[PDB]
Amino acid sequence: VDMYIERAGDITWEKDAEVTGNSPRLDVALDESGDFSLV
C-alpha cells in the first residue's frame, strides 16, 4: 500500500564510463497499452 520515493543521487554524465551493448535495429509495434512487440 505504501509506495514512496527515496533519493538515490545526482544525475550526471560519468566521464570515464564503462561501455557495453550492441546497437540492434529492430522492427517493432507499439500498441495502445504501451506494449512494444517485435514484428
Binding site: M3, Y4, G9, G21, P24, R25, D27, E32
Partner: protein, 161 residues
C-alpha cells in the same frame, strides 16, 4: 521532498521494502514510467505526490506538474544509462543506441539488461540532460533485452483564464 535528482520508487507492505522502479525529480515534478506506479499516488517523506499527467501508451507518468524533460537523443551519439538497480549503487553505463523502427518513426533503443526495478532510470546525453527513461522494451530471440529511450513531450504552458 522535491529536490532534483534520481530517486528509487519503493513499496512497503508488512515486511520491509521492495524497489519497484526509479524516477527523476526535475523542476519540482517527479517523472517515472507508468508501469512502475500504475499511475497511483506516491509518498515523499511526510508529503503526498499526486499524479498530474500520464499516458499509458508512452508508459510515462508525472507527479506534481506536467512532464518537464525535453531533451532528445541526437541519434548519433553514445548515451549513458544512469542505472539505479534494486539494492545497488547508482552506476553509469555508456552505450551506442540501436533503433526501434516503428510505422510512426524511429525510436532510440539501448541494449542494456537490468533488474525490473531499474525501470524509470534516466538515460543521459553528454550534457547530463535526461533524454528518456529506461525500461519499456522487448526481449529478442536469445533472451536479452532492449529498452526504448522513452521520452515525454514538454508541452507549452497552458493559457490562463
Amino acid at each position: 521532498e522535491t529536490t532534483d535528482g534520481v530517486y528509487r520508487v519503493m513499496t512497503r507492505r508488512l515486511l520491509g521494502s521492495t524497489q519497484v522502479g526509479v524516477g527523476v525529480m526535475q523542476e519540482g515534478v517527479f517523472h517515472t514510467m507508468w508501469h512502475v506506479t500504475k499511475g497511483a499516488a506516491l509518498r515523499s517523506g511526510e508529503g503526498r505526490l499526486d499524479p498530474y499527467w500520464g499516458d499509458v501508451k508512452q508508459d510515462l507518468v508525472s507527479y506534481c506538474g506536467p512532464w518537464k524533460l525535453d531533451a532528445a537523443w541526437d541519434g548519433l551519439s553514445e548515451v549513458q544509462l544512469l542505472a539505479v538497480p534494486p539494492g545497488e549503487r547508482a552506476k553509469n553505463i555508456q552505450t551506442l543506441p540501436g533503433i526501434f523502427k516503428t510505422k510512426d518513426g524511429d525510436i532510440g533503443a539501448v541494449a542494456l539488461d537490468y533488474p525490473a526495478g531499474t525501470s524509470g532510470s534516466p538515460i543521459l546525453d553528454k550534457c547530463g540532460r535526461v533524454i528518456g527513461l529506461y525500461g519499456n522494451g522487448v526481449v529478442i530471440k536469445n533472451g536479452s533485452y532492449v529498452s526504448a529511450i522513452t521520452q515525454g513531450k514538454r508541452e507549452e504552458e497552458t493559457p490562463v483564464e
